[PDB]
Amino acid sequence: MEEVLKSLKFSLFIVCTVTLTLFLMTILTVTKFRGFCFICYKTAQRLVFK
C-alpha cells in the first residue's frame, strides 16, 4: 500500500486517461448483463442447494 500511495503522484495523470476506460468497460458489461441476469440466479440456485 505504501508504494501505491506514492505512485498516485504520477498515476494521477493516468486517471484522466482511465476515465474513458470506465465508459468502455461499461458498454461491454451492458451486453453481458443480458445473459448474466439469468446466470446470476440460475447459478445461485444450485449454489444455495435448497
Coordinates of N, CA and C in Angstrom, one line a residue:
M1 N 0.8 -1.2 0.0 CA 0.0 0.0 0.0 C 0.9 1.3 0.0
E2 N 2.0 1.2 0.7 CA 2.9 2.3 0.8 C 3.3 2.8 -0.6
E3 N 3.8 1.9 -1.4 CA 4.3 2.2 -2.7 C 3.2 2.9 -3.5
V4 N 2.0 2.3 -3.6 CA 0.9 2.8 -4.3 C 0.6 4.3 -3.9
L5 N 0.6 4.5 -2.6 CA 0.4 5.8 -2.0 C 1.3 6.9 -2.7
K6 N 2.5 6.5 -3.0 CA 3.4 7.4 -3.6 C 3.3 7.4 -5.1
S7 N 2.7 6.3 -5.7 CA 2.5 6.1 -7.1 C 1.4 7.1 -7.6
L8 N 0.5 7.3 -6.7 CA -0.6 8.2 -7.0 C -0.1 9.5 -7.7
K9 N 1.1 10.0 -7.2 CA 1.7 11.2 -7.7 C 1.7 11.2 -9.2
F10 N 2.3 10.2 -9.8 CA 2.3 10.1 -11.3 C 1.1 9.4 -11.8
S11 N 0.6 8.4 -11.1 CA -0.6 7.7 -11.6 C -1.8 8.7 -11.8
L12 N -1.7 9.9 -11.1 CA -2.8 10.9 -11.2 C -3.1 11.2 -12.7
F13 N -2.0 11.4 -13.5 CA -2.2 11.7 -14.9 C -2.9 10.5 -15.6
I14 N -2.7 9.3 -15.2 CA -3.3 8.1 -15.8 C -4.8 8.2 -15.6
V15 N -5.3 8.6 -14.4 CA -6.7 8.8 -14.2 C -7.4 9.4 -15.4
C16 N -7.0 10.6 -15.7 CA -7.6 11.4 -16.8 C -7.8 10.4 -18.0
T17 N -6.9 9.6 -18.2 CA -6.9 8.6 -19.4 C -7.8 7.5 -19.1
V18 N -7.8 7.0 -17.8 CA -8.6 5.9 -17.4 C -10.1 6.2 -17.4
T19 N -10.4 7.5 -17.4 CA -11.8 8.0 -17.4 C -12.6 7.3 -18.5
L20 N -12.1 7.3 -19.7 CA -12.7 6.7 -20.9 C -12.9 5.2 -20.7
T21 N -11.8 4.6 -20.1 CA -11.8 3.2 -19.8 C -13.1 2.8 -19.1
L22 N -13.5 3.6 -18.1 CA -14.7 3.3 -17.4 C -15.9 3.1 -18.3
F23 N -16.1 4.1 -19.2 CA -17.2 4.1 -20.1 C -17.1 2.9 -21.1
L24 N -15.9 2.6 -21.5 CA -15.6 1.5 -22.4 C -16.0 0.1 -21.8
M25 N -15.5 -0.1 -20.6 CA -15.7 -1.3 -19.8 C -17.2 -1.4 -19.5
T26 N -17.9 -0.3 -19.5 CA -19.3 -0.3 -19.2 C -20.1 -0.9 -20.3
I27 N -19.9 -0.4 -21.5 CA -20.6 -0.8 -22.7 C -20.4 -2.4 -22.9
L28 N -19.3 -2.9 -22.5 CA -19.0 -4.3 -22.6 C -19.9 -5.1 -21.6
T29 N -20.1 -4.5 -20.4 CA -20.8 -5.1 -19.4 C -22.3 -5.1 -19.7
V30 N -22.7 -3.9 -20.3 CA -24.1 -3.7 -20.6 C -24.7 -4.9 -21.4
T31 N -23.9 -5.4 -22.4 CA -24.4 -6.5 -23.2 C -24.4 -7.8 -22.4
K32 N -23.2 -8.1 -21.8 CA -23.1 -9.3 -21.0 C -24.2 -9.4 -19.9
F33 N -24.6 -8.3 -19.4 CA -25.6 -8.2 -18.4 C -26.9 -9.0 -18.8
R34 N -27.1 -8.9 -20.1 CA -28.3 -9.6 -20.7 C -28.4 -11.0 -20.3
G35 N -27.2 -11.7 -20.4 CA -27.2 -13.1 -20.0 C -26.9 -13.3 -18.6
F36 N -26.0 -12.5 -18.0 CA -25.6 -12.6 -16.6 C -26.9 -12.5 -15.7
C37 N -27.9 -11.7 -16.2 CA -29.1 -11.6 -15.4 C -29.7 -12.9 -15.1
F38 N -29.6 -13.9 -16.0 CA -30.1 -15.2 -15.8 C -29.1 -16.1 -15.0
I39 N -27.9 -16.2 -15.5 CA -26.9 -17.0 -14.8 C -26.8 -16.6 -13.3
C40 N -27.0 -15.3 -13.0 CA -27.0 -14.8 -11.7 C -27.8 -15.7 -10.7
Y41 N -29.1 -15.8 -11.0 CA -29.9 -16.7 -10.1 C -29.8 -18.1 -10.6
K42 N -29.7 -18.4 -11.9 CA -29.6 -19.7 -12.4 C -28.5 -20.5 -11.7
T43 N -27.4 -19.8 -11.4 CA -26.2 -20.5 -10.8 C -26.4 -20.4 -9.2
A44 N -27.0 -19.3 -8.8 CA -27.2 -19.1 -7.3 C -28.1 -20.2 -6.8
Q45 N -29.1 -20.6 -7.5 CA -30.0 -21.7 -7.1 C -29.2 -22.9 -6.6
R46 N -28.4 -23.5 -7.5 CA -27.7 -24.7 -7.2 C -26.7 -24.4 -6.1
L47 N -26.1 -23.2 -6.1 CA -25.2 -22.7 -5.1 C -25.8 -22.8 -3.7
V48 N -27.1 -22.4 -3.6 CA -27.8 -22.4 -2.3 C -28.1 -23.9 -1.8
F49 N -28.4 -24.7 -2.8 CA -28.7 -26.1 -2.5 C -29.8 -26.2 -1.5
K50 N -31.0 -25.9 -1.9 CA -32.2 -26.0 -1.1 C -32.6 -27.4 -0.7

